[PDB]
């Protein structure tokens, strides 16, 4: 990367906001997955959207790849600089604006996390529900198409992103639904917002997100329920969904995951395949939901509910840190994770099969999942130096992905494709799907400089 180019970057954002130091680049060359670190040639911190536009235009016209970087909590290698280039860390733009409580909407910049937003909203009676375990950038969550434990009731990022401000690869500024606009529904033209949700930094740089807010629930009850088998826990889940109980949260942990979370968070749940549950409503509707849900879990051998502000907060903090609980089983390890999502009636087959396949192998694996969406993760601990085991883990993940595709599902419910699932995506949507996706990529990023090597 030439000295003249570095000076041009510094002229846009300021000398302190450009770094070519090896240690700084290495810290921005990896995320939380096992994908090996590939450092960008420079890291740049733009201070406003005009600077984002000017950095993008500079890189684009000089043939330098651009890698958007939020909080670096992704798990598919999205920020790995496989072709070098400039990593654009967006988190100094951290303002909340256009809070419209009467319309249930707010605008956030990339440095705003879910925790920051919900702190800003206390005593408003509103909250933002999409809750990945990590303290991630909300714009990064829009870029990956994230979901969370609350999505079963309150929707994913795709359901809750109303508008996006995007710097396109050559620097033009796009407001996907129109500048300043916010509304419940529209048929006006093609829905551009949905195209950029889940684009993972390959179509442009999200510099603000307009988010749907939700009313805080009148009352909340959380509980855990232990089961004799994975089959019994997942059968209960499917039957709760088929009975249309509007559960707020329904999370599955297998016995390995439950033990790991016990050791990592000082929960003391019985070591068993377990559902973490949460219900929202008035006392009238809560009693009803609890009736019907306990009836179904009882039929499948579930325990009497172990009830859980502080202990509920402990419970979900433990769930949100399950990834790190899994890592603590094998200290010094990184992990890869599957993330399939299947038609819910096929969820029992594939989780029970996954549990059986994990035991039939020497692999360490923990299972946790948004099973209310028909989605789950197998978190696979890897020694960073054991090449044999690492290709056993990638082969396991590949096979599980193809099993989900055989059942009519998808290879990723929320984490994305990044570097790891590109072959699975080709199988998932076929040749005409791949070409159509590539044609959209090419019109927005003709030079292929927008996070190259990812997704397609």
Ligand X SMILES: Cc1cc2nc3c(=O)[nH]c(=O)nc-3n(C[C@H](O)[C@H](O)[C@H](O)COP(=O)(O)OP(=O)(O)OC[C@H]3O[C@@H](n4cnc5c(N)ncnc54)[C@H](O)[C@@H]3O)c2cc1C
Chain residues in the site for ligand X (CB under 6 A) = 31-32, 67-75, 78-79, 90, 110, 132-134, 136-137, 139-141, 143-144, 146-148, 200-201, 205-206, 323-324, 414-415, 451, 454
The number of residues making up the chain comes to 456
- According to DSSP, the β-strands at 42-44 and 377-382 are unpaired
Nearer to ligand X, 235 or 278 (CB): 278
Nearer to ligand X, 67 or 315 (CB): 67
**Closest approach of Cβ 121 to ligand X, in Å?**
20
Nearer to ligand X, 290 or 450 (CB): 450
**Closest approach of Cβ 337 to ligand X, in Å?**
9
Q: In this structure, are residues 73 and 321 in contact, taking their beta carbons and an 8 Å threshold?
A: no
Nearer to ligand X, 58 or 157 (CB): 157
3-state secondary structure of 262: helix
Nearer to ligand X, 74 or 302 (CB): 74
H, E, C per residue of 123-179: CCCEECCCCCCCCCEHHHHHHHCCCCCCHHHHCCHHHHEEEEEEECCCCCEEECCCC
What the block records as the tokens of 78 is 């999205």
Contacts of 137 (CB under 8 A, 6+ apart): 70, 71, 90, 91, 110, 111, 112, 113
- After which residues is the chain discontinuous, taking C to N > 2.5 Å? 308
Nearer to ligand X, 9 or 79 (CB): 79
**Closest approach of Cβ 386 to ligand X, in Å?**
22
Helix, strand, coil fractions of the chain, as percent rounded to 5: 40, 20, 40
Q: In this structure, are residues 210 and 99 in contact, taking their beta carbons and an 8 Å threshold?
A: no
Nearer to ligand X, 302 or 420 (CB): 420
The Cα–Cα gap between 398 and 364 comes to: 16
**Closest approach of Cβ 444 to ligand X, in Å?**
12
The Cα–Cα gap between 370 and 153 comes to: 11
**Closest approach of Cβ 61 to ligand X, in Å?**
20
Alpha carbon distances (Å) from 242 to 134, 221, 442: 30, 21, 42
Q: What is the DSSP letter of 63?
A: T
The Cα–Cα gap between 238 and 342 comes to: 12
Nearer to ligand X, 32 or 278 (CB): 32
3-state secondary structure of 394: helix
Nearer to ligand X, 146 or 425 (CB): 146
What the block records as the tokens of 392 is 């056993």
Q: In this structure, are residues 408 and 346 in contact, taking their beta carbons and an 8 Å threshold?
A: yes
Biggest CA-to-CA distance, the chain: 70
Nearer to ligand X, 141 or 363 (CB): 141
**Closest approach of Cβ 202 to ligand X, in Å?**
7
Nearer to ligand X, 222 or 290 (CB): 222
Burial (CB < 10 A; 0-12, 13-18, 19+), residue 62, is middle
């Amino acid at each position: 990367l030439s000295q003249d180019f570095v000076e041009a970057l510094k002229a846009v954002v300021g000398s302190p906001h450009v770094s070519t130091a090896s240690a700084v680049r290495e810290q921005h060359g990896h995320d939380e997955s096992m994908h090996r670190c590939q450092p960008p040639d420079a890291v740049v911190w733009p201070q406003n959207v005009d600077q984002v536009s000017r950095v993008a235009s500079l890189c684009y016209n000089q043939g330098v790849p651009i890698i958007p970087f939020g909080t670096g909590t992704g798990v598919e290698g999205g920020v790995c600089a496989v072709q070098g280039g400039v990593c654009i860390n967006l988190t100094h733009m951290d303002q909340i604006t256009e809070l419209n409580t009467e319309d249930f909407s707010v605008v956030v910049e990339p440095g705003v996390t879910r925790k920051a937003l919900n702190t800003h909203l206390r005593d408003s009676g509103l909250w933002f529900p999409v809750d990945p375990g990590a303290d991630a950038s909300l714009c990064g969550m829009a870029a990956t198409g994230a979901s969370g434990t609350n999505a079963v009731r309150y929707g994913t990022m795709r359901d809750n992103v109303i508008n996006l401000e995007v710097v396109l690869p050559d620097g033009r500024l796009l407001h996907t639904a129109g500048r300043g606009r916010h509304y419940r529904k529209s048929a006006a033209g093609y829905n551009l917002t949905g195209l950029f949700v889940g684009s993972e930094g390959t179509l442009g740089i999200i510099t603000s997100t307009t988010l749907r807010l939700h009313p805080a629930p009148e009352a909340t009850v959380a509980a855990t329920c232990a089961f004799p088998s994975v089959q019994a826990a997942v059968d209960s889940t499917v039957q709760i969904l088929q009975a249309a109980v509007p559960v707020a949260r329904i999370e599955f942990l297998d016995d390995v995951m439950m033990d790991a979370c016990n050791r990592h968070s000082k929960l003391n749940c019985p070591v068993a395949p377990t559902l973490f549950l949460e219900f929202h409503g008035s006392q009238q509707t809560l009693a009803e939901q609890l009736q019907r849900t306990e009836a179904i879990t009882q039929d499948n051998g579930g325990s009497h509910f172990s009830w859980a502000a502080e202990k509920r907060n402990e419970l979900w903090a433990a769930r949100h840190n399950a990834w790190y609980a899994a890592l603590a089983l094998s200290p010094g390890s990184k992990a890869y994770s599957t993330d399939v999502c299947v038609p819910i009636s096929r969820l029992p087959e594939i989780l029970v099969e996954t549990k059986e396949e994990i035991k039939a192998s020497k692999l360490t694996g923990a299972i946790v999942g948004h099973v209310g969406d028909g989605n789950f993760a197998c978190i696979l601990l890897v020694d960073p130096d054991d090449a044999e085991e690492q290709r056993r883990v990638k082969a396991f993940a590949e096979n599980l992905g193809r099993r989900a595709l055989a059942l009519g599902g998808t290879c990723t419910g929320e984490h994305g494709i990044g570097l790891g699932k590109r072959q699975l995506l080709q199988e998932e949507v076929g040749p005409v799907g791949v070409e159509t996706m590539r044609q959209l990529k090419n019109t927005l990023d003709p030079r292929g400089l927008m996070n190259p090597g990812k997704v397609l």
